[PDB]
Amino acid sequence: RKPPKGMFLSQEDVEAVSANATAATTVLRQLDMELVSVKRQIQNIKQTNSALKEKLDGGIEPYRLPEVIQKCNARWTTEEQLLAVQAIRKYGRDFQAISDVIGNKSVVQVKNFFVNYRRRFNIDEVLQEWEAE
Amino acid sequence: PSGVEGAAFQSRLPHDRMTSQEAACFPDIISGPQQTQKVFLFIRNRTLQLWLDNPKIQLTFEATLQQLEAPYNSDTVLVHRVHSYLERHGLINFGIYKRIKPLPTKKTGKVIIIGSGVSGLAAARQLQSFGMDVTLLEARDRVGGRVATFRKGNYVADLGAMVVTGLGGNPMAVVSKQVNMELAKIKQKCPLYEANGQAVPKEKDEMVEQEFNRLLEATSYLSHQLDFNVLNNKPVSLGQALEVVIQLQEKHVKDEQIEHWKKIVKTQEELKELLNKMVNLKEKIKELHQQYKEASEVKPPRDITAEFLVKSKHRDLTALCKEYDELAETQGKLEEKLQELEANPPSDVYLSSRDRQILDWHFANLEFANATPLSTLSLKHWDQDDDFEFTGSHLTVRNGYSCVPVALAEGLDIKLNTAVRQVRYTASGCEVIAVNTRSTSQTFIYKCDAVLCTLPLGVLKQQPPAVQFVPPLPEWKTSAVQRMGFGNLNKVVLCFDRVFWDPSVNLFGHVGSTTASRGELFLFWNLYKAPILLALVAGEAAGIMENISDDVIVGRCLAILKGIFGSSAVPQPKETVVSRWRADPWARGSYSYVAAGSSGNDYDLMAQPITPGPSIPGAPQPIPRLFFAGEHTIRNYPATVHGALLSGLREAGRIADQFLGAMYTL
Ligand SMILES: Cc1cc2nc3c(=O)[nH]c(=O)nc-3n(C[C@H](O)[C@H](O)[C@H](O)COP(=O)(O)OP(=O)(O)OC[C@H]3O[C@@H](n4cnc5c(N)ncnc54)[C@H](O)[C@@H]3O)c2cc1C
Numbered sequence: 001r002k003p004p005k006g007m008f009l010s011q012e013d014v015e016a017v018s019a020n021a022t023a024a025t026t027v028l029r030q031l032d033m034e035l036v037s038v039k040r041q042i043q044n045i046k047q048t049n050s051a052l053k054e055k056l057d058g059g060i061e062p063y064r065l066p067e068v069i070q071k072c073n074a075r076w077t078t079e080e081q082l083l084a085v086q087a088i089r090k091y092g093r094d095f096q097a098i099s100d101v102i103g104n105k106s107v108v109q110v111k112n113f114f115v116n117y118r119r120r121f122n123i124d125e126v127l128q129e130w131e132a133e
Numbered sequence: 134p135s136g137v138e139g140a141a142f143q144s145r146l147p148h149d150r151m152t153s154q155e156a157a158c159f160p161d162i163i164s165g166p167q168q169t170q171k172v173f174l175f176i177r178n179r180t181l182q183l184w185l186d187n188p189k190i191q192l193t194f195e196a197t198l199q200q201l202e203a204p205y206n207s208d209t210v211l212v213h214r215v216h217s218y219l220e221r222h223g224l225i226n227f228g229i230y231k232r233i234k235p236l237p238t239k240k241t242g243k244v245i246i247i248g249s250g251v252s253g254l255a256a257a258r259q260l261q262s263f264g265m266d267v268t269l270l271e272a273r274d275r276v277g278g279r280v281a282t283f284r285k286g287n288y289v290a291d292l293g294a295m296v297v298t299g300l301g302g303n304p305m306a307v308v309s310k311q312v313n314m315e316l317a318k319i320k321q322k323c324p325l326y327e328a329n330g331q332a333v334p335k336e337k338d339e340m341v342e343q344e345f346n347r348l349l350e351a352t353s354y355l356s357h358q359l360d361f362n363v364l365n366n367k368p369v370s371l372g373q374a375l376e377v378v379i380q381l382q383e384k385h386v387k388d389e390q391i392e393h394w395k396k397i398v399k400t401q402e403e404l405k406e407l408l409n410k411m412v413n414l415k416e417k418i419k420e421l422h423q424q425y426k427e428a429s430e431v432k433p434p435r436d437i438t439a440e441f442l443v444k445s446k447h448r449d450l451t452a453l454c455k456e457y458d459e460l461a462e463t464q465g466k467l468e469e470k471l472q473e474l475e476a477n478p479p480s481d482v483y484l485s486s487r488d489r490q491i492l493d494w495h496f497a498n499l500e501f502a503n504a505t506p507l508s509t510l511s512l513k514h515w516d517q518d519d520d521f522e523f524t525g526s527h528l529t530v531r532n533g534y535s536c537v538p539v540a541l542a543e544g545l546d547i548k549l550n551t552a553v554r555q556v557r558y559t560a561s562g563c564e565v566i567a568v569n570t571r572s573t574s575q576t577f578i579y580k581c582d583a584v585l586c587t588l589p590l591g592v593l594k595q596q597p598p599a600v601q602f603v604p605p606l607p608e609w610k611t612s613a614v615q616r617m618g619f620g621n622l623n624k625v626v627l628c629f630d631r632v633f634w635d636p637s638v639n640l641f642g643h644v645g646s647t648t649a650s651r652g653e654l655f656l657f658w659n660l661y662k663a664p665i666l667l668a669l670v671a672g673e674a675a676g677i678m679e680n681i682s683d684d685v686i687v688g689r690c691l692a693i694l695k696g697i698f699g700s701s702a703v704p705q706p707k708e709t710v711v712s713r714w715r716a717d718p719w720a721r722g723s724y725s726y727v728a729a730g731s732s733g734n735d736y737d738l739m740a741q742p743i744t745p746g747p748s749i750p751g752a753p754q755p756i757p758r759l760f761f762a763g764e765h766t767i768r769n770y771p772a773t774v775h776g777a778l779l780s781g782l783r784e785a786g787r788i789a790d791q792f793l794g795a796m797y798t799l
Contacts, residue, residue: 001358004350008385009378011359017380018364024380031387038394045401052408056415059461063422064454065447082437083444090445100448101441 223782255781282535301524330696372508500672504620591721618728
């Protein structure tokens with residue numbers, strides 16, 4: 001029922017290699033075509049990738065910014081309120097970003113804000129304009 | 134086995150069941166109650182045992198009954214029936230033994246036996262043992278036929294049969310206690326030596342051999358499991374199957390390679406897409422950073438939008454730097470994955486040129502053992518005899534196998550140098566017309582009740598015929614002769630004054646340059662105490678090295694030997710001999726094989742004796758006049774000595790049943 005281990009003898013394969021005088025050498029040639037053509041395609045993509053890797057040379061070390069360590073404080077300043085409103089205008093409902101901009105208000109505090117001042121800051125109007133973009 | 138079961142096995146018989154044969158002669162018993170079958174079976178086994186335990190002296194029915202105990206020695210008709218059946222069909226009192234009852238004063242019936250081959254000689258001894266008149270007709274000047282033995286001085290070497298293929302149920306066991314044959318085992322270790330004279334390294338030798346054995350199983354699988362036994366309109370040879378298998382192995386190796394490099398490109402193209410993302414990020418990053426500088430340029434105090442801008446851009450930029458850092462983690466994972474795929478590639482090739490060459494020597498050993506190119510063997514059927522293989526070490530006859538035929542011929546009437554040219558068989562008898570081989574004109578005629586033809590299949594195959602059958606042999610028989618295979622193999626005897634090879638190694642191989650010449654001088658035997666080396670030719674090569682002179686062949690031989698043991702260690706041979714069996718007119722080849730398009734069943738067709746048309750039209754169906762025996766007639770042991778021997782014993786039995794009747798069948 002089973003070929004010896006490491007011999008591979010398919011019904012379909014047998015018919016394929018036997019059907020002609022040299023359907024056998026045919027099949028084993030077109031596998032040398034496929035093989036050499038894939039090895040060529042590897043060369044193109046190795047070369048292509050090597051160029052793109054030299055475009056990224058230097059990493060992004062020149063563009064990275066050191067980190068601000070500020071502690072999440074419950075008091076809104078008017079500064080911070082205004083930051084918020086603009087941050088909304090630009091960021092819609094993304095709390096992580098708005099928290100990151102203000103730099104001393106946790107994500108919760110921001111949602112809170114959203115409801116607290118919604119009336120006085122028309123966070124409605126602000127948000128439907130964010131949507132317009 | 135051992136005990137009585139040991140006799141039954143040692144006589145190629147199941148200890149615990151009745152054979153098809155025995156059913157025919159004891160159909161009362163085998164249709165009867167179980168209990169009596171086991172009595173019979175014990176008796177058979179027991180009598181066999183006795184014969185075997187001392188095969189140098191005839192075993193009488195009296196001495197047999199005397200050794201039995203009750204219940205088994207009660208029914209003495211049964212004991213008699215058994216002992217007679219065994220006597221008749223050569224299971225006991227066969228070969229060379231001290232007869233107790235001297236031979237019948239008067240003989241009955243007359244049988245002419247063509248050829249004092251081992252089959253011939255075996256039959257003859259039996260028939261004359263049975264008391265029938267027997268005369269043997271041998272074209273050759275000596276008995277043995279394909280058992281030829283070269284002798285000169287103390288050099289002794291078979292150019293014909295050399296080996297007893299195991300003693301486990303081999304009748305030649307019996308013979309060997311009757312004739313003193315210097316039986317000696319064969320150490321099966323065979324070191325190879327490439328083209329150049331370099332021993333093949335154990336690494337390779339083991340790898341290649343295993344691949345061989347694997348390839349064989351493969352064929353067997355193609356045969357039975359996939360039914361690849363007929364290709365196109367023709368049958369498939371072992372050769373084609375092996376090619377197709379090997380083609381499919383090289384195919385796989387490329388398929389492996391293909392899908393492995395296709396992994397690499399599919400990965401490489403992921404990496405490519407990742408790098409384009411990474412570059413277009415690095416560009417938005419440069420640009421954002423610039424904007425964030427330009428927005429920190431504006432100096433405090435600044436209004437709130439300006440402050441927003443700085444903070445905004447600061448956040449937008451650290452988002453993108455975060456994203457880019459996680460792309461560069463990804464990049465590292467792929468780039469190492471690719472270094473691992475580069476590191477672990479599938480094998481480059483199925484087999485190298487050096488590998489294939491070694492694999493060819495393993496095929497040449499197969500070609501030698503079958504005596505023919507694997508392109509001639511039947512895929513399905515070549516191996517069919519392998520089931521009946523004997524158990525035990527293979528052995529050589531050290532003092533020459535001819536000792537056996539010679540000893541068998543003692544006491545027989547053998548006409549040497551008498552070349553049968555025509556066999557005439559009719560309802561009323563037979564005449565055989567021979568000539569003298571020395572003098573083609575001088576003519577002999579022999580008349581007899583029956584003719585036993587041991588003519589080698591090569592001969593029976595001859596066109597135009599060396600022997601003429603009157604009337605012609607039936608189409609069913611001629612087609613059997615035509616379909617069956619007769620092969621060729623050759624030996625080169627190299628007799629040297631001093632031993633320069635390894636005295637503890639019986640045989641070593643030489644690997645051929647090409648596929649074409651793999652068989653050519655591919656193997657050497659050192660079995661003889663004396664300093665003799667045998668070189669064997671096989672496969673397609675044997676058939677061609679018959680056309681090359683001995684000086685040239687011995688040349689090529691020494692070449693190879695010098696290459697393996699060095700120019701100053703290999704003398705000239707004192708004596709050289711080279712077989713050509715396909716040339717020999719009395720063999721016309723070496724032995725049989727199961728050609729493609731042929732079945733084990735043809736070996737039965739060959740044994741089937743022939744019954745002539747009636748003399749007077751509308752007269753009763755006559756007796757069967759012509760009988761065949763020999764290596765090519767025994768389906769279960771072809772191409773062997775023991776096979777022949779057995780076939781001889783079988784026709785002797787059948788002939789005497791015909792011509793002296795069977796007392797046992799009642
Ligand atoms: C090189 C070689 C090595 C072998 N090695 C082994 C081995 O190692 N082990 C093993 O078990 N078997 C071996 N065999 C096979 C074995 O020897 C034979 O199958 C066996 O001897 C067959 O005996 P036979 O009686 O059928 O035919 P043969 O022994 O050939 O008998 C036929 C006889 O008929 C004669 N004859 C032919 N034509 C005529 C004619 N027209 N008129 C009168 N007589 C004629 C022949 O000359 C011969 O004497 C080997 C064979 C060969 C060639």
